[PDB]
């Protein structure tokens, strides 16, 4: 969710 997105939007 917003705790995978939040941190995968930094890693994508």
Same mark, same amino acid.
């Given at each position: 969710?917003? /705790? /995978?997105?939040?941190?995968?939007?930094?890693?994508?």
């Amino acid at each position: 969710w917003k /705790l /995978l997105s939040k941190a995968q939007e930094k890693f994508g």
